[PDB]
């Protein structure tokens, strides 16, 4: 049984999005979304479809790029640290559930490498 997807709306939004969050939306997410390995990460893991009955027994905080995109677009985040941690939760969920060497893990790692390359140029918070 799949739980509802993570919330994408925040009833207490900041008055504005920092430059860092704008960069995360317009540069980082845009770049990751179009990567050849992005596709398994653009929506929640469907553990019914994938026949993974223990997925939520193991993964306490599901996360995916679709959720992150919506959060960025909806002014859900107060700062870049929150968003960066959501990306980190997404990648590490994959590493926790799967095994070194697995195709999905190799895909996640290449996507993560790109993520780290893109946040290299994250602006100083203003």
Curated annotation (Swiss-Prot):
There is a cross-link at residue 57 (Glycyl lysine isopeptide (Lys-Gly) (interchain with G-Cter in SUMO2)). Signal peptide: none annotated. Phosphorylation by CK2 disrupt the intramolecular binding between the bromo domain 2 and the NPS region and promotes binding between the NPS and the BID regions, leading to activate the protein and promote binding to acetylated histones. In absence of phosphorylation, BRD4 does not localize to p53/TP53 target gene promoters, phosphorylation promoting recruitment to p53/TP53 target promoters. Residues 16-122 form the Bromo domain. Ubiquitously expressed. It comes from the Eukaryota. Changing residue 98 to A: Abolishes binding to acetylated histones. The record marks 98 as: Acetylated histone binding. JQ1, a thieno-triazolo-1,4-diazepine derivative, and I-BET, a benzodiazepine derivative, have been tested on tumors with success. Treatment with GSK1210151A (I-BET151, a I-BET derivative) has strong effets on mixed lineage leukemia and promotes myeloid differentiation and leukemia stem-cell depletion. Chromatin reader protein that recognizes and binds acetylated histones and plays a key role in transmission of epigenetic memory across cell divisions and transcription regulation. Remains associated with acetylated chromatin throughout the entire cell cycle and provides epigenetic memory for postmitotic G1 gene transcription by preserving acetylated chromatin status and maintaining high-order chromatin structure. During interphase, plays a key role in regulating the transcription of signal-inducible genes by associating with the P-TEFb complex and recruiting it to promoters. The NET domain mediates interaction with a number of chromatin proteins involved in transcription regulation (NSD3, JMJD6, CHD4, GLTSCR1 and ATAD5). The C-terminal (CTD) region mediates interaction and recruitment of CDK9 and CCNT1 subunits of the P-TEFb complex. It is also required for maintenance of higher-order chromatin structure. This is Bromodomain-containing protein 4. It comes from Homo sapiens. The chain holds residues 44 to 168 of 1362 of the full protein.
């Amino acid at each position: 049984m799949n739980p509802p997807p993570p919330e994408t709306s925040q009833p207490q939004k900041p008055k504005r999005q920092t430059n860092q969050l704008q960069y995360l939306l317009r540069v980082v997410l845009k770049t990751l979304w179009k990567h050849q390995f992005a596709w398994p990460f653009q929506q929640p893991v469907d553990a019914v479809k994938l026949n993974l009955p223990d997925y939520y027994k193991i993964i306490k905080t599901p996360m995916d790029m679709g959720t992150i995109k919506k959060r960025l677009e909806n002014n859900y985040y107060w700062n870049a640290q929150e968003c960066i941690q959501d990306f980190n939760t997404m990648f590490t969920n994959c590493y926790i559930y799967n095994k070194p060497g697995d195709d999905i893990v190799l895909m996640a790692e290449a996507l993560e490498k790109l993520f780290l390359q893109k946040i290299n140029e994250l602006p100083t918070e203003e």
